[PDB]
């Protein structure tokens, strides 16, 4: 029942105390049923006091002030921040990981039972609670739903952050988005003791933990997909199309990384060049095997035939990466924004090189 209360934003612990009160009222109702078994006078004194004795015996603190005094004592001691988590805006919040996945969030769901207890004891009907429950209510009006949503989004942020943490380069690239989140947090926590901008930092903390989850899945998709395309070589290869797709993937990877929230070329060029290099490397290994399988007195042609076609397709040994795999260069321009062209001459350079290699290989004497 308290689980339904937590599944419905209600008093969990205060509802448990009131639940005890209701079941004890059901015991009193059972005593009234035995009273209904009798008339309406004084002919019901045999075991009625014993009935109330058993009902109050297993429920000695059901509807009494003992639960109210317990909530009041808990509030007076320390139950003021659970229902009053106002520090989830720009305050004490230990966030981070191995890659520094830091943001602004809370964990109000842990002490949510004490939170709901103090909140219901201070706002339902005004139960016995000290001024600390009122402080919890004021800080609740400050950042209550923000702390609850921040706890939920923090849980989802850590869950998506684990998948993003599967690759360390994804954390290095996600740092570029964490810088934007920290920039918004710096803009919201930039004024020297702003007495009127706490709700923006609380709403930004909730949206920041949600952005950590969504950005964790997105940055993991970008970096891990670059690693996946880099390690994906079981579809089609053994031509210039594999390395061409790798180079175009590097260009599109730099553009897609530029479409995100970052400002330094490092993670973008790293994912782009890494995807192109390892994609062309794995596809080049398979292509090397298939390339050896497909493109590996006039009577003195034995001299040329001794080593005629040993290298019919040797125009693809670019130090495994080179970032500009092409056996020639392209044209020029004056001024624009085209900082993602890896190998612009990769459409005819190595093509003419390998074609002349195969032609001179099979025709080393003609």
């Amino acid at each position: 029942a308290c689980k339904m209360s937590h599944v419905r934003d209600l008093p969990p612990v205060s509802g448990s105390i009131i639940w005890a009160k209701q079941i004890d009222r059901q015991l009193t109702a059972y005593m009234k049923r035995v009273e209904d078994v009798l008339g309406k006078g004084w002919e019901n004194h045999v075991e009625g006091q014993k009935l109330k004795q058993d009902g109050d015996s297993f429920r000695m603190k059901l509807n009494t002030q003992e639960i109210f005094d317990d909530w009041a004592r808990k509030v007076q001691q320390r139950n003021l921040g659970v229902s009053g988590r106002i520090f989830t805006i720009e305050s004490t919040r230990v966030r981070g990981r191995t890659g520094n996945v830091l943001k602004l969030k809370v964990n109000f769901l842990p002490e949510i039972i004490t939170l709901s207890k103090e909140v219901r004891n201070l706002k339902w009907l005004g139960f016995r609670v000290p001024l600390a429950i009122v402080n919890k209510a004021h800080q609740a009006n400050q950042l209550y739903p923000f702390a609850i949503s921040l706890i939920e989004s923090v849980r989802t942020y850590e869950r998506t952050c684990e998948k993003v943490e599967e690759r360390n380069t994804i954390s290095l690239l996600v740092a570029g988005l964490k810088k934007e989140v920290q920039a918004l947090i710096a803009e919201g926590i930039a004024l020297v003791w702003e007495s009127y901008k706490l709700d923006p930092y609380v709403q930004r903390l909730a949206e920041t933990v949600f952005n950590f989850q969504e950005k964790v899945d997105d940055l993991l998709i970008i970096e891990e997909k670059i690693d996946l395309e880099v390690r994906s070589l079981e579809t089609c290869m053994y031509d210039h199309k594999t390395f061409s797709e790798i180079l175009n993937r590097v260009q599109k990877a730099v553009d897609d990384l530029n479409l995100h929230s970052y400002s330094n070329l490092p993670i973008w060029v790293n994912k782009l060049d890494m995807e192109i290099e390892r994609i062309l490397g794995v596809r080049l290994q398979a292509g090397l095997r298939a390339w050896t399988q497909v493109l590996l007195q006039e009577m003195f042609a034995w001299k040329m035939v001794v080593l005629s076609l040993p290298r019919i397709q040797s125009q693809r040994y670019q130090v495994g990466v080179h970032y500009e795999l092409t056996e020639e260069e392209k044209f020029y321009r004056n001024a624009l924004t085209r900082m993602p062209d890896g190998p612009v001459a990769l459409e005819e350079s190595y093509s003419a090189v390998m074609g002349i290699v195969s032609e001179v290989e099979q025709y080393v004497k003609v």
Binding site: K179, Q182, I185, I189
Partner: peptide
């Protein structure tokens, strides 16, 4: 979260 975090920490002091 490095330069922006350091700026926010310096502003907090």
């Amino acid at each position: 979260v490095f330069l922006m975090k350091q700026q926010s920490l310096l502003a907090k002091q």
